[PDB]
Each structure stands twice: as structure tokens, then as C-alpha cells.
Amino acid sequence: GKELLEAARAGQDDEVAVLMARGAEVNAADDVGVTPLHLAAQRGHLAIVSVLLAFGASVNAADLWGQTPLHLAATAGHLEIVEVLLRSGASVNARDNIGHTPLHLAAWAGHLEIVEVLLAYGADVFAQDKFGKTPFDLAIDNGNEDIAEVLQRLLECRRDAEAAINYQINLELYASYVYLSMSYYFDRDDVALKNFAKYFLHQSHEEREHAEKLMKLQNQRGGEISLQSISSPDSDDWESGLNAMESALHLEKAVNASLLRLHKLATDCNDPHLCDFIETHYLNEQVKAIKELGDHVTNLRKMGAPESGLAEYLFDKHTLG
Amino acid sequence: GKELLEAARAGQDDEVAVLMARGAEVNAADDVGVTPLHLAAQRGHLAIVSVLLAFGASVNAADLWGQTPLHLAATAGHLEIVEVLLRSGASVNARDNIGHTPLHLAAWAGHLEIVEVLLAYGADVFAQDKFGKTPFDLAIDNGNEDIAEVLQRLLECRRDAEAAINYQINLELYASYVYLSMSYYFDRDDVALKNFAKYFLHQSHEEREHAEKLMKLQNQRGGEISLQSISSPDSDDWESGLNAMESALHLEKAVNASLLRLHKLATDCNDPHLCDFIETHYLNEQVKAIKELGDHVTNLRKMGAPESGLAEYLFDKHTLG
Amino acid sequence: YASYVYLSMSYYFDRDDVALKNFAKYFLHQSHEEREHAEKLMKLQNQRGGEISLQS
Amino acid sequence: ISSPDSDDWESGLNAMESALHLEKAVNASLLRLHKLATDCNDPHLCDFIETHYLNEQVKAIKELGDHVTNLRKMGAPESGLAEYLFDKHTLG
Amino acid sequence: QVKAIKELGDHVTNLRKMGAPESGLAEYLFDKHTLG
Amino acid sequence: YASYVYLSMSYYFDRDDVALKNFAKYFLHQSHEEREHAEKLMKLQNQRGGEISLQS
């Protein structure tokens, strides 16, 4: 009923064994709320926590102070207990009264391997306590040096991915604006080409769908969209249909280069979902766009444009309409 | 690895406790195939089998001789071990090399309460061994008196239910034959009533569906259908429509009485499915048949039959057609 | 009598140590055809003015 | 929920026989619960048990015993082309 | 009656040639292919 | 510019600490209507013979 806890505290693995074989209280709440699992985690005793878990102990046991065996085990420094608790269902994001999470304590105490296993199981790096500190702060105010480095790397990966997605949103909005300009150039009455105009209006709308997809993505990730100013296109007079097609080709190539840079960034920081998203929705459309626009340019050049009217007229009639 | 079995045999519950707390072989196969559970069941040691089941022992462990902890526990006489094994998934119908089932041994040894708990969990009373004996035989050739009585009661319940279902099949076949006779009486040309004929032919076919339902039932239960001779109806001349309706009424009442006797029999022998079957398919149709045939008889009697032609003519026209 | 024999045959193949379903359907069909056969002869004997006398 | 006793059910015959024993154990538990509800005068529980549970177990046991005798007569498990043709003709 | 006798003799010779009654998989396949 | 402002407004109400979906649909609809409005004026200025000069 109560005589098991002192044997757990003294490390009497055989005594708690023989006394738990006989019907005994496994989920004992004590004079301050310390279950035998808590005391078996404070001291480093793997056999006791194993034979206690097998007999039906609770890994999440709300101590009178707000602690859990994972808290005390991460604070102590015993890695095997941390592993066997994480595999049994311990919650990596449980709070104290101060608000500390097991990673706060892992960073304060200075346990690198425990920090790694806690980061693998879903502990978040920018979580705060009541007083406003993140594990990186408890790491830098205590001289624990490498905890700080491996947490700074993750903070920086998240910040840089957020920034690159914002820049891609701005780049697609700019491309949409450039295509709108191109389209209303071919609508003048000294440039009377209607299917060039329809072509570039269609591209203008597709490029806005592209940017809204990235906005939705960044809201799904929990990041912050920060919209910016959209530059005006470099020209108002796109001299001909050939020159406009070549400018669209260079623009599509620049967009594709930015996508490749963002993909390499998401690969460095171990982000499978971002890489899958980029290559599923964005890398096969750019290849097809570049192929098609290069086809248009060689067709127009062979037919004899720009020095030939009746080349752009018949291209506009037969290929674009 | 092996040092746990002698402690199980000596009844050292605390030793096997402390030694199983430390990583030890729970499903140990030994020099003749005797697992610690077998030896913990032979001797009466409930704590050891509990702490062995909790640590992942197999209740069905094919000994080199064909035994299982349930076999040895039923032979010994310890009821608590039998219960905790039956609740953990022990198979009540496992065989030896001789072919004995745990009930064979429960009946040989003379353990009444174990026989009861084994009968509650699905042990069958007429199972045989290689030499052809049923638990009742091992009970009567050993002077074990009450095992024999409580097994004879069950053998007799099954035999009597089988016999009553056979008799009900024969009774419905006879009723079908009687209705066929009645129907082809009203088809003569000195008895020119067509809707009386259609009525009784319909009843003739319904009563054969009734008997095929009981044949299917008896095949679902695992019993043996034994068909018999069908008597001929008592009359070939059913004097009038009134007299034929009254004879049908008495026949339906006799059939209903037999159904009630069979239901009381199935209630005495604790057979919920048979009772549910009888009252679902058979007891509400008889009530409606009796109500309808009594209605027909009072209508015919009030209109003035049998001493009135133009009473049965108009009944045949208006009520039966 | 033939109808009764076919009914017996049909419910033999329905046991679970004799698990043949289409043998069972076959013999049930024959069981019903043989009762139609006998009702035809009953109708005939009523058309002729004779007396049906059913037996065991 | 305990894990099943085997991961390797040696053949189709052995798996059908194991399913048969499992259905019989389930039916025994239902009968015990029905007797309990009868002792304590609980008409609605008894009606529920025999309406939804006692006629399905009987049909399951009949069908699984049919499958076992068919497979045994065709010549399984020592015969391929017995379980192949059973799988083709009876189960599909 | 003539058609019934012809058909039932056909069934008997088919079953005998396939190898029944000493062969399961003869009555199984007869039941599957001829009667259903 | 008004179209851009409405797009910002719409994707604000899509965050998961601001879980209002019909506010989001509302402001997206307004965002698209305001671009139709500007394309109408571009077409007008091409009908008049003037020069469109787009800006930041």
C-alpha cells in the first residue's frame, strides 16, 4: 500500500519486484503526490521504472508541484529512462507551474543527448515559460554552449524558410503584374493582335493562383505572411511579339531559379513536407512553361519575325487561336 | 533463463517475483516441455500464475505429452486457477494424445465446481476420446455420482429437444395434408364453391413452409432430422363449409398447444435461442389464425348456414373472394 | 411419396458435414414438381366424377 | 486489446478452424451474459441479446463448419489446387 | 418421365467418370459446374 | 492597391488564431472585384488612344 515507495527510493529493485508480484498499489499517490515512478526517475533506476510501467503505471502523473517523471528524468541526466518514457507515451510538452517543459530543463542542466532525443520526439524550440524565456535563453545564461548552438541552428532554419516563402510570394505577384502589362500592350490599335493579348491575360491570372497557393501554405505552417511593395514592369513598350515572348521566357527562368534555391534551403534544414510541396506543385509547371515558350520563340524566329508582318499575324491566327 | 522454474515448483512466489522483475524467460520451454505455468498450475499457486500471466505467458502451451495448464489445473482441483485461466483465454476443448478434454479430467477426478465452471465456458458434454468414452462414462465408471447426474440432465435436455422438433415437423406436414384434402373437397361438382377451395389450398402451402423452417432450424442446431409416416386425414367428406371451418379451427388449436409444450420444454432446459425462435416465428401466427377462423365461423353461423344455401354462396363470394 | 423422398434427400445435403448447396436446391425443386404432378391427378379425378380417397 | 496468438496461420484450413473456435468462444460468453440477465429480472437485456446476437452466432458457426468440411473433403491442406479452387469457387 | 430418366442417367455417368464417390473435388466441382 | 489590401485582409482571417472562414471568403471576393474594376479602366484608356503607364 505504501511500503513500496521507500524501496523504490533506495533502489531496491528486487524488493519492489517481489512486493509488486504480490498485489500492491502501483499508482500510489503519496504525502506530497510523489508516485514511485517519480522517485524511480529522480534516481537512475531503469529496472524499477520498467517493472513499474509493465505493472500499469501512469507516465503523466501530475505532481503537487506540476512535475512528471519526464521532467525529473530530463533534469537528472539519465538517457535510458528518458527513452523508455518517451516510448511509453510521455508528453514532451507538459508544463510546470513556472511553465517549464522538459526541453527547458534539458537545456538548463546541459544534457546534449537528452536534448537530441527530446527534439526528435516533437519538443518545440521556441516555447516560453511564465517569465518569458525559451530553452535557448536558459542555455545561454548558464554557459551550456552546444545546446545553444544546436538550438540556434533550428531557430535560424525556421526563420530563413519563412523569409524565402515571403520572397516567393512577392516574386509571383510581380510576374503576374508583368504579364498584365504585356497583355494590354497587344490591345493598342497600333498593335492589333488579339490572341497574344488573351494568351498573356491567361498567364497573368495563373500567376496569381500560384501566389495564393504559397500564402495558404504559409498559413498552414504557422508562419507570418508579410506582404510588400510590387515593382512596376521594366517596360511599357514591348517592341513586338517575339521580344515579348523572349521576355516571358527569361522571367519564367528567373522564377524557376528562385524555386530551386528555396528547395535546396528546405533540403538543408530537413523539411520533407516543404520539399514535397515544391516539387509537386511548382517544379513540373516551370519545365512545361519553359518548353512551350521556347517552342513559340523558335517558331516565330523561323517564320521570319519580327521583320515580317504576316508572320506574327499568322502565328496569332494559327498557334494562339 | 532456467532458474525460475524450480522456484515456481517450490512455490517461491517472492523469488519468481524478484527474478521476473529482472529480465527473465517467461515462455521457457524445458527439458520435457514443461513451462513454469504448467508447474505453477499442477501445484496450487495462484500468485505465481497471476504474475506469470501479467508478464506474458501463453495459456495454450503444447506440452510434449499434449497437456496444457488447464488440463493439469482441472485434474488437480484448484478452482481459482481454473477461473483465472478461463478468463485469460484457455481453450476448453483442447485434446491430449488420448484425446481427453479438460471436462474429461474434471469428471474423472470428481470436481463438481470445476465441472460447472467448465460447462459455463462452452465445454461440450458428448465429446469422446480415442477409446470412445464421454465424460459421463469416466464419471460413472469411477463412482463420481453427481457429475454423472448433472451431465445426464444435459444429455437428456438435448435429446428431448431434438425429439420435440421432429414431432413438430411431422405435425405441420399432417396439417398441410389435411388442408389439401379440405381444398379438393370443395372442388367437386356437387360442392361448387371455388373460393373455399382457393382458401384451403393457400393454407396447405403455408403449412409446408412452416415445416421446412423447422427442418432448417434443426440442421442449424446440429441435430438429426428423422422423417416419419404421415397419417391420412380423418374425413374425405367435410359435410359443409361451416363444418370444414370448425375442423380447421380445432386443428390450429392443437398445433398451438404443441408449440406451447415445446416452448415450456425449451425454457426448462435453458435454451434462449429456441425460445426466441418459437415466439418470433410461430406464436403470433397461431393467434392470428385462430382469431380469423373464429371470425369466419361466427359470420357463417349468423348468416344462417349450414341449413341455408345463399349463406355459403354469398360468404364465398364476399368474404373469401 | 416421391415428393416426400425428395424433400428428405434435399435436407440431407444441407447438414454441415455434407456441405453441398446445389444438390440441395436440385432436390428441393424436384420435391415441388412432384407435388404439382399429384395435384394434377386430383383435379383429373374430380373432372371425371370419381372420389378421391387420400391415404397414409 | 491483446494481440492475436499467431502471426502465421499455417493454411486456409487452419485459419478457418481458428475462426470457428473463436466464434464458439464468443457465443459462450453471450450465453453466460444472457443467463445473468435472466437471473436479475431484466427483460430488455435478454430481448436485446437474443434479437441481435444469438441468431448471428448460429449462422456463423454453421457456415464456418461448412467451409471446414468442404476444405477437408477436397483434400486440403496437403493439396494445392484444393485451396486454389475453394478460393475461386466458394469465396469468390 | 423419359426426360427425367435421361437427365438422371447423365448425372450418374458424369459423376462416375469424374471419380466419385471416392473423390472429393469430384462432387465439389460437379456441384459447382453442373448443378449451379 | 485596393485589391492588394483586400487580399491581405482575407488571408488574415485564415490564420488558426483567427478562425473565421466567411470573413475570408468575403474579402477574397472583394479582392477579385477590385481587379476587374482596374482592367475596365485599362481597356477604357486603350479605347481613347492614350498610354497606360503602370507603377509600383
Numbering used by the authors:
A (entry chain A), B (entry chain M): 54 to 374
C (entry chain L), F (entry chain F): 227 to 282
D (entry chain B): 283 to 374
E (entry chain L): 339 to 374
Sentences from the paper on this structure:
In this study, we present a novel DARPin–apoferritin scaffold, with a larger size of around 1 MDa and higher octahedral symmetry, meticulously engineered for the binding and imaging of small target proteins via cryo-EM. Our most efficacious constructs, namely models 4 and 6c, feature a designed ankyrin-repeat protein (DARPin) rigidly linked to an octahedral human apoferritin via a helical linker. The modular design of our scaffold allows the adaptation of new DARPins through minor amino-acid-sequence modifications, enabling the binding and visualization of a diverse array of proteins.
To facilitate two-helix bundle formation, we incorporated a glycine–serine (GS) repeat linker that extends 12 Å beyond its predecessor. Additional enhancements included strategic mutations at the apoferritin–DARPin interface designed to bolster the stability of the DARPin component (see Sections S1 and S2). Dimeric DARPins were observed encircling the C3 channel of apoferritin, while the GFP molecules firmly anchored to their respective DARPins on the outer surface of the scaffold [Fig. 2(b)]. Our scaffold, with its high-resolution GFP structure, outperformed other reported scaffolds by requiring the fewest particles, thus reducing the demands of image collection and data procession, and setting a new precedent in efficiency.
